[PDB]
Amino acid sequence: MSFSQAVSGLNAAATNLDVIGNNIANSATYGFKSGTASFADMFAGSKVGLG
Amino acid sequence: MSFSQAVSGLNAAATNLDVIGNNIANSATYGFKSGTASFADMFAGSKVGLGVKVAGITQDFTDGTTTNTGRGLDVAISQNGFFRLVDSNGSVFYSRNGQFK
Amino acid sequence: VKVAGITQDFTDGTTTNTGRGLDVAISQNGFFRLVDSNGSVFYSRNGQFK
Amino acid sequence: VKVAGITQDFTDGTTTNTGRGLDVAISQNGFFRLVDSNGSVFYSRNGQFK
Amino acid sequence: LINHAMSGLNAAQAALNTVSNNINNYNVAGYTRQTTILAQANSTLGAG
Amino acid sequence: GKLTNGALEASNVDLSKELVNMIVAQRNYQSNAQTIKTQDQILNTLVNLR
Amino acid sequence: GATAATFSLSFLNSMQQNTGANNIVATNQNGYKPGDLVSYQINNDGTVVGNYSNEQEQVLGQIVLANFANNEGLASQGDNVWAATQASGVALLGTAGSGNFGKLTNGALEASNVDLSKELVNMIVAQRNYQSNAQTIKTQDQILNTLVNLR
Amino acid sequence: GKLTNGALEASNVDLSKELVNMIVAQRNYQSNAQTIKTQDQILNTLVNLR
Amino acid sequence: GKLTNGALEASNVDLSKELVNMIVAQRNYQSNAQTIKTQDQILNTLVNLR
Amino acid sequence: LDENRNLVNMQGMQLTGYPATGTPPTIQQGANPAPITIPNTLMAAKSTTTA
């Protein structure tokens, strides 16, 4: 628990925002494909133990 | 960066708008051919890199409505083919516009 | 920044006809010479004389 | 920080039309030569002249 | 955008004035038809 | 190509396609700018938040 | 300074009907001069073809399509460059229309299959998650500095 | 040049130039306003921090 | 380079460019202010020690 | 098209494909995907042998 949880979740959200922004950036690039990030549970006792 | 992704894209879009504005500005320039620019994705390192990188221009070579004007010095080449021009530098240039004097 | 300048164009008259026997304007460059109550010599292209 | 420098960029702006017979601007590459009030040869990229 | 469109505004003003003189002077004896010419670009004359 | 005389070659620019491209470019720029805005305002929120 | 040819000529399927009809219809001589080129075209199969002044045709080109297993492994390395790797399997090859292979188009282009509005709803969601995590980071900071404050 | 009688000549003030100049220079007005505001934000940040 | 006559060259500036520079400067000064404030509270902790 | 008439993406990346072989050229279906270069040259001088 503690800092790691919130920092990791913060950066997870920001990560998916990264691919969203890159999709926006290449929204005109022909044949370009829409991307998304894969997420997983930081299991440590708690299923959100470190976020 | 997500932010960079957007910024790069915004910047590129500014370039696209510039070329579009020039397209309109030329919308009656005799013999003129229309233009557009080409984008690329600035993936680097991993993930998305930084955004989009942009270096490319597209020009079409279809022949517009070849209009008739009657001057004995008005010429146009249908389909490929171009006129040769020169300046005081001894240069050689090619052009499609064919109004002469 | 600081700003310092006043400069003007001198292309010719947007031309208009009136037929009044005192409207005078100069085609091509050149200006008029006028004198005030004190005789002060001033220059103008306005052609509305009376 | 450790940085100490000036920079001025030679990149071009838009070419604009006025018609003044003393408005002169530089395409691409170059710089203007002038003599100041003292004989020093001074230099500018501005194109407004009288 | 802005510079090119506004330059085109001036160019159109010129062309319209030309045709307006033409239609005006359609009945001036010995008048000769007037026409205007224009020029912009290919691969750009702006060096970046 | 064959030569035509007493004629001239028009602009192959289509005004309609350029108008639609103009508005779509508005949308592209607006998407980029508003993504910038949302990220910037919420980031400044975080940069302030500490 | 050249070389010349020779041919055999025959007239299959001709018929002489005892009543009234008379005409020739068949077109076959296989020779032509080395034609000059004005054309080149690309079709819905990936081929590239050209035709020449001798009103005859020449072809050299086929574009290869490939099937992959873990397609995400074909990651873009910039300039839409797939990095084709084991992490995606391999490129199992076939030309457009090879049964298990789609169709091609030329003089055309495929959209960026993104949509801006969808991306903005997703952005709303993600930025709100980011807000939550930010506030929680500061919450933990506050609690831990409170524990430091007690002393 | 030469003189005309019963005619007048009008100014060079074309609305197309001047209104677009007003538009761009008002863009600059708001640009410097945005700069001013952000400088105020800078000081207000530094003021409130201590 | 070849010269322009009766013409002027704009500055190599863009409003969007300068607003981007403004955003990055906002981030820079906010970063410097936060970097101060943290070590500044640590210093005030030191002032409580010495 | 690149200056040598090779088919390329804008980065100059060379369109790999199967070439035709023989005369009349016929596509090699088992082959190294390689840049197709558009002929700068006239075709075969295939004279007559049958009619």
Automatic annotation (TrEMBL), chains C, D:
Subcellular location per the Swiss-Prot or TrEMBL entry: Bacterial flagellum basal body
Summary of the function given for this chain in its UniProt record: A flexible structure which links the flagellar filament to the drive apparatus in the basal body.
Family: Belongs to the flagella basal body rod proteins family.
The protein, known as: Flagellar hook protein FlgE
Source organism: Salmonella enterica
Organismal lineage: Bacteria, Pseudomonadati, Pseudomonadota, Gammaproteobacteria, Enterobacterales
Region of the whole protein represented: 52 to 101 of 403
TrEMBL record, chains F, H, I:
Domain Flagellar basal-body/hook protein C-terminal, first and last residues per copy: 5-49
Localization annotation: Bacterial flagellum basal body
Primary role: A flexible structure which links the flagellar filament to the drive apparatus in the basal body.
Family: Belongs to the flagella basal body rod proteins family.
Protein name: Flagellar hook protein FlgE
Protein species of origin: Salmonella enterica
Section of the entire sequence shown: 354 to 403 of 403
UniProtKB/TrEMBL annotation, chain J:
Origin: domain of life: Bacteria
Regions annotated as coiled coil: none
Residues spanning the membrane: none
Signal peptide, first to last residue: none
Compartment annotation: Bacterial flagellum basal body
Boundaries of every Flagellar hook protein FlgE/F/G-like D1 domain copy: 1-47
Function of the protein: A flexible structure which links the flagellar filament to the drive apparatus in the basal body.
Family (UniProt): Belongs to the flagella basal body rod proteins family.
The protein's name: Flagellar hook protein FlgE
Annotated source species: Salmonella enterica
Gene from which the chain derives: flgE
Location of this fragment in the whole protein: 102 to 152 of 403
